Design a protein around this ligand. Structure first.
Ligand code: F43
Ligand SMILES: C[C@@H](OP(=O)(O)O)[C@H](NC(=O)CCCCCCS)C(=O)O
Ligand SMILES: O=S(=O)(O)CCS
Ligand SMILES: O=S(=O)(O)CCS
Ligand code: NA
Ligand SMILES: [Zn+2]
Lengths: 548, 247, 442, 548, 110
């Protein structure tokens, strides 16, 4: 009936969403908020304990002259203060990143060829199972060969393990199911058929190293840690000399020749090793999100779960901490996953496309871009004009620009079945938005959006790239909030509409279809809400080795 | 060749191990079959696996170096490259890690030798490995109490001996028989049980270990007391240091 | 005229080509053939037209296992290779009569591209070769089939991969012997980041040619790095001559004398005899039944020891027809020669040090791999200044098929394309010829 | 009288330390150990809870056929099993790294020049104090300008703050003392005078960002997080426009022009940004350790406290996790800070030098290197030969090589007062050791030690460097255990003997003389022991925001 | 003179070397040029400025004709001046590494 955001707006304000006027200044400042009151009290205790002033509401300007809003986490009935969605205050958000950072995919195909060709030994579903029992002892940090080894405490590293998957059902059947990511169990029939065809008779490990290690160290640790314990377990299970020439072949295969990192390394100005957020391409992020395999009948839900995944990771943790820090960028991101606002805009666009073209049935050209992106942009902007509560909610121009353009781009991609024309729609939305309201985002919001139109279909060296392959290190995109997570959504959009099992990498898609992960990637926004309520239990805590 | 400086028995023993014209003393008799069993790379009577076709069946490039360098028999046949690995007790084992690798590359063709503190390894074509391994096991390269054939779990070189004077072995691949005073190899070098144990003979007595050892120790001959050997090492240090600075 | 040294130059059959050549006629700074080889390697690119076509047909672009469903393009690229290559050359060339070369190979499945030297005369480095070639072929393919604005970005992905999201050309279907400048371990390292397997591939497993190309590249890098400046220049030039150029037929003759039954140890004995015979070393002091050797020319002793090192590798790894033991030869040749003489080993211990880590990182769990994937820019094998890697190239050339990560596995594209260039394939022949040409110019 | 290690050997074994024989195989394997028994039970619980096999003592080879030793943490009376000194199991070790990783030093000279010259405003100790109260609100992640900002929970980020120091005593006295690192309080008279002369009228911030952020993100986050909140506080405290041209100057000053990172970024093969262990030069590490200012009358204690700091960080965390992983390298490192073994060897060398030359009175040449390094090397190796229990204790050759050469190198530096001849002694020790026992370390232990002698005094591009400037990224040193922490000790050695206040950077030395740090850098080995006993309370825990 | 080498605020106490470099700039520059040049008549340029406080160096183009990139310029220049300064004052093997640090900084650790 209502727009999907009406309940949220009603929960925020005393006024009806349509009302143009309100009352300020008499709300008690920070005292209106349970959370800010908790912070003020905490700041006093912290300062006293350590002998240095810390949090103090009297420093600078006085928060809370307007209503400090609750936010509904989209698709949930959970309403929380915005502070509960700051990544520092939300264990679910921290664990989502840890679960990606500590994952690598490592093939066994080169390794098995070394065993059979160089060593002259046999590989069977039986030897593989033995290897897997060995590596699941070894991977968390325990010994298999040497005498007088000291080891990691198993309870501190309980979240570390190794599983395998293959497209060959019979071989998968022969391996102990405790070690197997069952593609036929986790995916719907047509999707499972596609993924098994992509993988074929290949056998791949999904390695997850301990969260406590990932937090002590960095992302570039993951593929190295993985390789060391794969190496030990190959020695143990296949009876090599513990350190012969063939051992080097296994190292090179596991570290280089058949490894899939979640993120590639970054240039010097933003120097980082592998498996950091900036190296994760938009296509991978879409495939890490598991909404595709549970919500496949709803392409909007799938696309917007990917937007939530990316907005949090790319804006809050990556741009808001790795690349800057401080108070950071919580609400730049929450705009994309709260109050069912982006949902309303994107369901509108989906229905528009569905009624006019049919999904994936529009011509893949500029005519379609001009049609869909313009229509959806005008809808979104009209909602801010008709509902003053909505405009006061998403108060920053950057936040409105991202949300409107995300709906416009996803909807264009719903029509064409192609992410590149979806991207063209995103940029057109920005241009129309700017002229309509004589504003867009913050000072430097549209660096990429002004370069945008010309670089969508460019083929030049550092300009030309399918959107799925782009990411936070694509030059235009390397700096600014309110884009990266939304691009991940646009990457997902045409594939969700087409019913594709994956966006860019099928191995990555399968790798996170794993019930033994700590974070539930099938319900990203549900997890964010759980973290906001302080009900999420992360891995990597040191409680076992510290005083009571 | 002079091989090594020094005027101690240790220094002479090091020279002897390296000198291909010095005939190593044979201490024990081991069958061809039992060498294969100890290695554990194939069963007795199993054909040598190959890693590539015989050289006579491949079209090798026009190459003067290939013409001048005679391939070992295992290379001609296309054998796998396999290994044998030894651990030597710091309590006066006859051979020691660097002594082995230096000697190997003086005595043997087509050899890949590696030195570590608790283990020493040679890798070469399988059928040639078997020939070399006979010599390594039968001669004074090996003492069945103070040395061990170990492809993994090598811990022991630095450990105290047990009551029988045997070196520690986590997998106990060599067992001292109190009834014979002889050592039997009960497992192959990777630690899998042998169908029938291999007689490795008696451990050398204290006096003979002293005569034969290549490790310097304060309770044997100390390195600091082989002043000519120390002098050459200090010379190497100084000349390396000066050379890195200028010429 | 800077140094008085002269060497005799031979071919790879051990025949004298040119006697009494001034040492500096072999310098990277002077020798026009070394200049041509370096400038060739900067400007040469292999293009896999078949790979591009298959990537497009399947939408498998941007790295391992990657695919974008719905983006497939069926283009007859190999079938129209002649027209596409001609169109590409028109964009790559500066003028119609310059040194641009574009040659189809494998029935059009591959292309050898040599970007004109004029482009490098006004470039800071070497990346113009892959980047100019990539965009010329992307544009040529788009123009050939009139690929729409909407689909053209797929052709770009098929050619150059995930760049610029990735720093490298991840998933690219072009290849060069050099890698991107960002991957340098230090300034001046670019000619060192050429995989050993690439060198062996380019020289078609000819042991002496592989040793030569490797030494030329390594020692030329030593000049760019500033290591061969001033006090150390002569040592580096003598190393190039004796270890890589087979000067005075020393390597060849040590191999001939020890090839039938020899070992690393017997090669050492012969080399020490030869050095003594030629007056490079003399007995400095007598201990107890032990002669301590000295020298009035450490650079020449180093050169002789380096030639022995190369010969010992050819004898030891040649006997095994297996490359893995080269790490052992590099270690113990140097370890043994020091205790045999009382003189420092090759590169004053640095080859031995490199060999220790090289052995570890080719027989352990921690990294590295087989001999063929190393190079002078690898963290494991960068430490010796030009004296270690040439032996690894020799060893891999002699390998009869014991390696999993062989040149066939890592360098197939390099082999088909770069081996077509005569001066890459037979570098020793050309550097010797050029040195004779500029003989009385030094 | 007794060797310093004798009591430890008596605690480990029933036998007298001199006895050559013992009993094996009859100890019950892992059952002899309280810690391994804890691990076996924890592995059962972990596997049962998650449905995947994990720690299993029966995988591979059976640990504990020999005595699984307790280790004495050197200079303490604490005996623990080796597993308690694994960095994963030791919260003190993790917090030591976090305290380094989350620190930057940022000048205020430039910044104050911009305020006076470009904004035309005055800077006084009063304005600096107002700025400091502001930035201590802001730095942990709280707002000072915008309305409707969400903030970090003050209790989660209680460990984050900003202090300043200056060499000008009278100005330091005028800034509120809660914010000042008092050089005259923390350092002895002569050292205080040296450090104050070095800093002069300069004013420097020591910024520490939250541990929880450092663990979620990486080291390269630190200087960025620092700069954002320095920027906000400059705006607030000095009444800028919140975002004018001058704001860019403060950004460039805080991020580039006057920032001192703990570690510099690393090349691609081991790609990492700033403030990771590989970028920390040996001279900085020696200066981070605060033993110099409390144990200034015992140069051996100072040098070995630095070795403990470096062995743990460089071998256990950096090489053992960042660069590899798994079970890792606990005992490669513990060899340098347990059982008072390195202490015995180094006190011998110091007494030898003191007795023959006098500290820092030897000629700085090869004659001194040959004398001292040879003498000390022979002493150390003799102890392994005289005491079979000692040889069984430090069972790996790598561990003996590092300990013996560390004593030889430190002693040579005690003699010459110069770290470079100390380094030459280290390499000579290795060469003698190798020939004496016909073994040295593991397969690839002496890559750097064979290159070593020639590269000590080289002046070539990537070879020549004073030891103080070398670090984990110096090419020869980039790979291998049993060197880097010891080199840090040798760097400290001549400066400890000389009585120098610092080794390489005075700002780094002062920056860690701060009682508000979580880890106690004045007693590193005491802290390791506290962590081993599970008595250390780290920062960064998520208990407040998770289920109870 | 101050042993302040290797980056901002960095200093190694006890490593000070008192060398009159600017006073002997002409001799040092001539020695450096001899190492930087390939031949005598080539396009190497070494020119003193500011009374010997500064030097303009142009490394001969022949070095770049056989180089992959451009780093030969700072690296060849640095080592020529390091060696020239060492030779000028007969700096000992033990102290020469300080001259290297003063010219090129903390490379290669950085
Ligand atoms: C498989 C290798 C080859 C390789 O790449 N790494 C190994 C094994 C690896 C594993 C052993 C874990 C396990 O048992 O599952 C780890 C812990 C690294 C990891 N993956 O976490 C390690 N070595 Ni190793 N490794 C060590 C050592 C050593 C010594 C042990 C000599 C002895 O007599 O016991 C020797 C080298 C030498 O001879 O010098 C050695 C060899 C080897 N090292 C031989 C196996 C030897 C064997 O078969 O028993 N390490 C040491 O010398 C001390 C420290 C120790 C490390 C663990 C720690 O620091 O706590 C461990 C460090
Ligand atoms: C050599 C290199 O490995 P790669 O050959 O690149 O795979 C390197 N490893 C290491 O140096 C690991 C060092 C610590 C483990 C060995 C300690 S002795 C690295 O991962 O960058
Ligand atoms: O005001 S600016 O656009 O510079 C920053 C927005 S957070
Ligand atoms: O045995 S190796 O020296 O390769 C590894 C030692 S941990
Ligand atoms: Na017989
Ligand atoms: Zn971290």
């Amino acid at each position: 009936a209502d727009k999907l955001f009406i309940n949220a707006l009603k929960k925020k304000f005393e006024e009806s969403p349509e009302e143009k006027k309100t009352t300020f200044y008499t709300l008690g400042g920070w005292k209106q908020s349970e959370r800010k009151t908790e912070f003020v009290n905490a700041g006093k205790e912290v300062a006293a304990k350590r002998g240095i002033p810390q949090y103090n509401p009297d420093i600078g300007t006085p928060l809370g002259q307007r209503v400090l809003m609750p936010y509904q986490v989209s698709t949930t009935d959970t309403y929380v203060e915005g502070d509960d969605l700051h990544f520092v205050n939300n264990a679910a958000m921290q664990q989502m990143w840890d679960d990606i950072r500590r994952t690598v995919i490592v093939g066994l195909n080169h390794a098995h060829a070394v065993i059979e060709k160089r060593l002259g030994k046999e590989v069977t579903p039986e030897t593989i199972t033995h290897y897997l029992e060995t590596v699941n002892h070894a991977m968390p940090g325990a010994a298999v060969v040497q005498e007088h080894m000291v080891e990691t405490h198993p309870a501190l590293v309980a979240d570390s393990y190794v599983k395998v998957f293959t497209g060959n059902d019979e071989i998968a059947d022969e391996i102990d199911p405790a070690f197997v990511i069952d593609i036929n169990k986790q995916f719907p029939e047509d999707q499972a058929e596609t993924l098994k065809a992509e993988v074929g008779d290949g056998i791949w490990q999904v390695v997850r190293i301990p969260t406590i290690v990932s937090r002590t160290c960095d992302g570039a640790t993951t593929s190295r840690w993985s390789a060391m314990q794969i190496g030990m377990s190959m020695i143990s299970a296949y009876k090599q000399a513990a350190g012969e020439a063939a051992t080097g072949d296994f190292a090179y295969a596991a570290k280089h020749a058949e490894v899939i990192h979640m993120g590639t390394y970054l240039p010097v100005r933003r120097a980082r090793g592998e498996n950091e957020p900036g190296g994760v391409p938009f296509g991978y992020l879409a495939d890490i999100c598991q909404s595709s395999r549970v919500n496949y009948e709803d392409p909007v839900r799938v696309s917007l779960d990917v937007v939530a995944t990316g907005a949090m990771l790319y804006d809050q943790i990556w741009l808001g901490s790795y690349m800057s820090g401080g108070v950071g960028f919580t609400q730049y991101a929450t705009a994309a996953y709260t109050d069912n606002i982006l949902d309303d805009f994107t369901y509108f666009g989906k229905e528009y496309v569905e009624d006019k073209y049919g999904l994936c049935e529009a011509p893949n050209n500029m005519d379609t871009v001009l049609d869909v992106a313009t229509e959806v942009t005008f809808y979104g902007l009209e909602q801010y004009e008709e509902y003053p509560a909505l405009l006061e909610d998403q108060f920053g121009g950057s936040q409105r620009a991202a949300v409107v353009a995300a709906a416009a781009g996803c909807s264009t991609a719903f029509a064409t079945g192609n992410a590149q024309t979806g991207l063209s729609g995103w940029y057109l939305s920005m241009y129309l938005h700017k002229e309509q309201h004589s504003r867009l985002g913050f000072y430097g919001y549209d660096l990429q959006d002004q370069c945008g139109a010309s670089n969508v279909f460019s083929i030049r060296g550092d300009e030309g790239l399918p959107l799925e392959l782009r990411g936070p290190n694509y030059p235009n995109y390397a700096m600014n909030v309110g884009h990266q997570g939304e691009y991940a959504g646009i990457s997902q959009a045409p594939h969700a509409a087409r019913g594709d099992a994956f966006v860019f990498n099928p191995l990555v898609k399968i790798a996170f279809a794993d019930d033994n992960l700590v974070f539930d990637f099938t319900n990203v926004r549900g997890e964010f809400a759980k973290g906001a309520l302080r009900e999420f239990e992360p891995a990597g805590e040191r409680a076992l080795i510290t005083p009571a | 060749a002079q091989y090594y400086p020094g005027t101690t028995k240790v220094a002479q023993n090091r020279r002897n191990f390296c000198n291909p014209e010095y005939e190593l003393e044979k201490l024990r008799e081991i069958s061809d079959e039992d060498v294969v069993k100890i290695l554990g790379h194939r069963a007795p009577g199993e054909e040598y696996p190959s890693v590539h076709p015989p050289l006579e069946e491949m079209d090798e490039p026009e190459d003067a170096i290939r013409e001048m360098v005679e391939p070992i028999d295992g290379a001609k046949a296309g054998d796998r490259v396999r290994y044998i690995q030894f651990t030597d007790s710091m309590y006066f084992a006859p051979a020691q890690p660097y002594v082995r690798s230096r000697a190997y590359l003086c005595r043997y063709r087509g050899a890949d030798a590696g030195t570590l503190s608790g283990r020493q390894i040679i890798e070469t074509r399988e059928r040639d490995l078997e020939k070399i391994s006979k010599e390594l096991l039968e001669t004074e390269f090996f003492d069945p109490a103070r040395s061990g054939v170990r492809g993994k779990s090598v811990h022991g070189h630095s450990l105290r001996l047990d009551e029988d004077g045997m070196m520690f072995d986590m997998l106990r691949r060599q067992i001292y028989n109190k009834d014979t005073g002889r050592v039997e190899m009960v497992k192959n070098q990777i630690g899998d049980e042998l169908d029938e144990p291999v007689d490795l003979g008696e451990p050398l007595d204290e006096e003979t270990l002293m005569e034969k050892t290549t490790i310097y120790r304060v309770d044997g001959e100390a390195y600091r007391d082989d002043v000519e050997a120390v002098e050459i090492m200090q010379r190497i240090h100084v000349l390396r240091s000066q050379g890195g600075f200028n010429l | 005229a800077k140094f008085e040294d002269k060497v005799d130059l031979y071919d790879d059959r051990g025949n004298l080509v040119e006697e009494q050549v001034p040492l500096e006629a072999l310098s990277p700074l002077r020798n026009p053939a070394i200049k041509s080889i370096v400038q060739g390697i900067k400007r040469t690119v292999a293009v896999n037209l078949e790979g591009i076509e298959n990537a497009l047909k399947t939408a498998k672009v941007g790295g391992p296992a990657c695919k974008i469903m719905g983006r497939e393009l069926d283009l007859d690229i190999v079938g129209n290779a002649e027209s596409i290559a001609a169109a590409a050359k028109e964009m790559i060339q500066v003028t119609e009569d310059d040194d641009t070369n574009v040659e189809l190979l494998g029935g059009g499945k591959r292309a050898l591209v040599q970007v004109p030297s004029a482009r490098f005369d006004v470039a800071a480095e070497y990346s113009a070769a892959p980047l100019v070639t990539a965009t010329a072929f992307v544009q040529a393919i788009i123009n050939e089939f009139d690929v729409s604005m909407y689909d053209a970005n797929m052709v770009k992905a098929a050619v150059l991969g995930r760049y610029p999201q990735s720093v490298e050309y991840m998933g690219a279907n072009i290849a060069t012997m050099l890698d991107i400048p960002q991957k340098l371990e230090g300034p001046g390292y670019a000619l060192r980041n050429i995989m050993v397997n690439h060198v062996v591939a380019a020289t078609l497993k000819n042991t002496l040619q592989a040793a030569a190309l490797s030494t030329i590249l390594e020692q030329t890098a030593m000049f760019e790095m500033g290591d061969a400046v001033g006090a150390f220049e002569r040592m580096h030039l003598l190393g190039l001559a004796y270890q890589g150029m087979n000067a005075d037929n020393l390597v060849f003759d040590l191999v001939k004398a020890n090839g039938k039954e020899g070992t690393v140890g017997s090669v050492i004995a012969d080399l020490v005899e030869r050095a003594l015979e030629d007056g490079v070393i003399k007995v400095e002091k007598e201990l107890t039944d032990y002669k301590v050797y000295g020298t009035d020319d450490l650079a020449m002793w180093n050169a002789y020891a380096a030639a022995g090192l190369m010969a010992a590798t050819m004898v030891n790894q040649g006997a095994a027809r297996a490359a893995q033991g080269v790490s052992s030869t590099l270690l113990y040749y140097n370890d043994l020669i020091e205790f045999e003489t009382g003189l420092p080993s090759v590169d004053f211990g640095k080859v031995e040090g490199t060999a220790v880590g090289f052995s570890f990182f080719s027989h352990s769990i921690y990294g590295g791999g087989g001999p063929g994937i190393f190079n002078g820019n690898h963290i494991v094998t960068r430490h010796s200044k030009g004296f270690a890697i040439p032996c690894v190239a020799a060893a891999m050339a002699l390998d009869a098929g014991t390696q999993m990560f062989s040149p066939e596995a890592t360098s197939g594209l390099i082999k088909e394309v770069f081996s077509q260039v005569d001066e890459f394939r037979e570098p020793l022949k050309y550097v010797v010829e050029a040195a004779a040409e500029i003989k009385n110019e030094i």
